[PDB]
Amino acid sequence: GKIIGIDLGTTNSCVAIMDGTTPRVLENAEGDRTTPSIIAYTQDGCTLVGQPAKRQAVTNPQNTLFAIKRLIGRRFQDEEVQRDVSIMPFKIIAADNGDAWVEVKGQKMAPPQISAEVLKKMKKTAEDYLGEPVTEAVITVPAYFNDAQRQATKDAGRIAGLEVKRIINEPTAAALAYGLDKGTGNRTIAVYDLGGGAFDISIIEIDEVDGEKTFEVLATNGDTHLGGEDFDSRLINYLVEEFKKDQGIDLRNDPLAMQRLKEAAEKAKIELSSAQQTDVNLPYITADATGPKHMNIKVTRAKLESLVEDLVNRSIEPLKVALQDAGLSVSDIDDVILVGGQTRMPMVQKKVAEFFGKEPRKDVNPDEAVAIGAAVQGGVLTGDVKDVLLLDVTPLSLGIETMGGVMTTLIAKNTTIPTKHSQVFSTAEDNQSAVTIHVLQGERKRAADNKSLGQFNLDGINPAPRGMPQIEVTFDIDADGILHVSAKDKNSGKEQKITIKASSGLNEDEIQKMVRDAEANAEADRKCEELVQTRNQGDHLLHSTRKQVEEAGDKLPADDKTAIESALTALETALKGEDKAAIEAKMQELAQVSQKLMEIAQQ
Amino acid sequence: KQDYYEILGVSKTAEEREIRKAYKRLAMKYHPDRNQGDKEAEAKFKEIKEAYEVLTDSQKRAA
Numbered sequence: 001g002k003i004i005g006i007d008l009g010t011t012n013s014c015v016a017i018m019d020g021t022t023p024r025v026l027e028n029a030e031g032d033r034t035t036p037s038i039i040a041y042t043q044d045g046c047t048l049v050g051q052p053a054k055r056q057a058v059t060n061p062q063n064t065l066f067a068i069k070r071l072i073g074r075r076f077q078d079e080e081v082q083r084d085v086s087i088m089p090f091k092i093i094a095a096d097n098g099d100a101w102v103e104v105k106g107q108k109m110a111p112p113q114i115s116a117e118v119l120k121k122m123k124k125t126a127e128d129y130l131g132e133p134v135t136e137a138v139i140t141v142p143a144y145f146n147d148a149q150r151q152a153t154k155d156a157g158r159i160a161g162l163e164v165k166r167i168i169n170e171p172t173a174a175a176l177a178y179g180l181d182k183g184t185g186n187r188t189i190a191v192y193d194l195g196g197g198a199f200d201i202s203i204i205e206i207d208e209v210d211g212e213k214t215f216e217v218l219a220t221n222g223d224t225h226l227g228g229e230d231f232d233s234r235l236i237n238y239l240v241e242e243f244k245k246d247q248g249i250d251l252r253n254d255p256l257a258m259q260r261l262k263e264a265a266e267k268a269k270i271e272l273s274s275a276q277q278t279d280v281n282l283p284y285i286t287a288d289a290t291g292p293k294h295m296n297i298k299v300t301r302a303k304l305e306s307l308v309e310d311l312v313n314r315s316i317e318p319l320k321v322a323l324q325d326a327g328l329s330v331s332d333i334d335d336v337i338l339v340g341g342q343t344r345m346p347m348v349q350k351k352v353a354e355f356f357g358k359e360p361r362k363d364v365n366p367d368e369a370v371a372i373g374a375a376v377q378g379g380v381l382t383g384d385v386k387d388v389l390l391l392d393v394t395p396l397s398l399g400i401e402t403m404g405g406v407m408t409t410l411i412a413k414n415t416t417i418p419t420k421h422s423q424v425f426s427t428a429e430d431n432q433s434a435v436t437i438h439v440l441q442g443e444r445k446r447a448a449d450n451k452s453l454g455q456f457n458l459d460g461i462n463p464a465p466r467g468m469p470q471i472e473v474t475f476d477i478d479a480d481g482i483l484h485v486s487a488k489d490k491n492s493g494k495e496q497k498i499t500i501k502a503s504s505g506l507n508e509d510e511i512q513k514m515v516r517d518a519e520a521n522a523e524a525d526r527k528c529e530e531l532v533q534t535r536n537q538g539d540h541l542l543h544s545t546r547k548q549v550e551e552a553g554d555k556l557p558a559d560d561k562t563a564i565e566s567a568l569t570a571l572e573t574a575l576k577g578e579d580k581a582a583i584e585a586k587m588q589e590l591a592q593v594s595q596k597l598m599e600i601a602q603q
Numbered sequence: 604k605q606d607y608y609e610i611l612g613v614s615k616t617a618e619e620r621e622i623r624k625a626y627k628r629l630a631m632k633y634h635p636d637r638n639q640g641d642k643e644a645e646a647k648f649k650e651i652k653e654a655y656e657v658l659t660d661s662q663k664r665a666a
């Protein structure tokens with residue numbers, strides 16, 4: 001088949017495909033090229049994705065999920081997860097194994113399911129355009145995603161009914177999307193990605209040798225929990241503090257008011273990317289005991305810049321670190337490109353431009369470059385583009401915990417992937433039954449200060465003196481950037497089974513069940529689409545019949561008129577409901593009674 | 604187990620700039636991503652990398 005490309009964003013998602021030799025982004029059902037990454041669960045059993053979900057969020061706050069990318073692959077006790085727990089309208093809860101989940105209508109749900117709903121909308125869009133089924137996709141993740149996040153995204157892709165060929169890092173995808181225009185030559189570029197939830201910086205070299213583009217990632221750094229949402233949060237906090245200051249009401253209790261306030265806040269930020277002053281104007285924001293209250297606050301561009309300056313500065317440090325790891329200076333960067341909606345803010349462009357002493361390119365669409373890059377990568381996997389190769393790296397050092405809590409690096413950060421590293425382990429005590437290895441990702445010197453991938457237990461070590469047996473352990477990092485640990489008896493070659501404990505993520509059982517539930521939800525959503533179309537047919541029939549009655553006038557039996565009008569009203573009532581069977585029944589009855597009218601037509 | 608220099612095919616005294624040229628073209632030939640075919644290429648490629656990494660480091664190259 002064909003491999004579609006999916007930019008799965010914190011805020012907006014996007015799907016692009018490979019029209020032979022020229023990739024194109026596909027508009028969704030509503031005609032938008034970018035689909036909001038919002039997922040709503042209605043009372044009636046339907047599932048809304050994108051702009052509809054965005055519309056009905058105010059009446060269904062607890063069941064409208066957003067920013068799930070900022071929970072996927074994370075633990076419930078993570079600091080950022082707790083801070084979000086206090087903030088979000090929906091209920092974030094700890095799973096059975098400690099992973100961060102969300103509760104919808106009393107059901108516990110894993111982030112890969114929700115993100116899989118979004119993925120399903122993208123896949124269905126691609127199928128509608130293509131006219132044939134789609135089973136294979138390349139999905140984008142931030143460069144700084146840890147192992148558990150990447151594996152969790154891959155699982156979300158599997159629940160979407162997709163065979164995930166490649167997990168691509170967003171700045172890398174944008175890099176080749178930018179690189180297809182360029183001719184033969186050598187360049188070095190800095191990709192600055194500041195989206196709705198994540199920030200990445202990647203230093204990438206693009207050399208052309210024998211008609212074969214080589215995109216080598218020299219370095220990468222970033223923060224997976226820094227994005228537009230936090231700019232929004234700063235402006236929100238300012239508005240709340242000013243409202244409590246002027247009217248005496250802490251607005252953080254009213255969740256509806258907080259929803260209206262986040263909408264207005266982001267709107268004001270975006271409006272301040274091109275104006276010099278806007279007004280946050282919310283009438284009847286809340287109801288005091290004495291009477292309803294109002295908000296009308298002036299915000300200058302300078303005020304917003306002051307409110308988010310430390311956030312902007314938080315992004316400059318990984319530039320220094322990345323240039324250090326790449327062994328380059330600011331003057332070695334031939335081009336710098338901005339990716340992500342949040343880079344549209346004038347201050348971000350100014351701070352970046354002044355760090356590099358250079359003006360970023362202007363011919364890059366930050367909203368559409370990642371997706372088209374993913375589509376092209378899919379083309380590389382199939383074969384339709386043979387002139388491009390991508391050499392990505394892993395962003396985090398992979399090590400094990402040793403005595404004293406210190407961490408020991410096995411594979412350092414910025415190592416080109418896929419890669420393999422083997423090491424010999426042995427027993428430490430006489431007749432040691434088993435050995436346990438603590439595998440983690442991060443740069444900190446204490447094991448507790450890093451992200452634990454888990455404890456791998458090699459049981460079934462027959463008794464022996466301390467230190468005699470030799471077991472070779474092999475650490476693999478595939479092209480997705482995901483770890484695969486295999487073991488083997490060094491001397492003999494007999495394999496060694498590995499038990500993973502204290503780990504994160506879904507397993508095969510959870511996966512299968514959630515695939516089945518995804519299919520069931522798919523059939524249910526088909527039925528919902530059916531009900532919408534049937535409701536349209538009903539409204540058309542109402543209009544047609546009333547028109548025909550007026551045209552008929554007095555020349556219609558009073559009994560017939562009466563019965564038809566009763567049937568009409570019954571049908572209108574059925575059309576206000578959500579029962580397809582009742583609507584169809586009422587339509588049929590209306591036809592039976594309006595037989596005389598349709599006879600009166602007579603051409 | 605195989606000679607680093609020989610699997611890339613280098614003079615054994617050629618400078619870093621050349622071994623990088625050889626790595627990039629070999630990475631092209633043996634990348635799993637490119638062929639998409641098998642683990643055999645990814646297993647071979649991982650070693651072509653490992654040779655490129657040891658030979659660009661000055662001290663480890665002396666070893």
Ligand SMILES: Nc1ncnc2c1ncn2[C@@H]1O[C@H](COP(=O)(O)OP(=O)(O)OP(=O)(O)O)[C@@H](O)[C@H]1O
Pocket residue numbers: 008009010011012013069194195196197198199227228229266269270273339340341342343344345366367
């Ligand atoms: N004109 C603008 N000025 C300032 N910010 C903007 C503008 N347009 C969009 N944004 C911000 O960009 C963010 C989303 O951009 P984008 O779609 O690139 O993020 P994403 O890729 O979905 O998120 P991520 O890549 O972090 O997962 C939103 O938070 C929005 O507030």
Ligand SMILES: [Mg+2]
Pocket residue numbers: 007009010170195340370
């Ligand atoms: Mg993005």
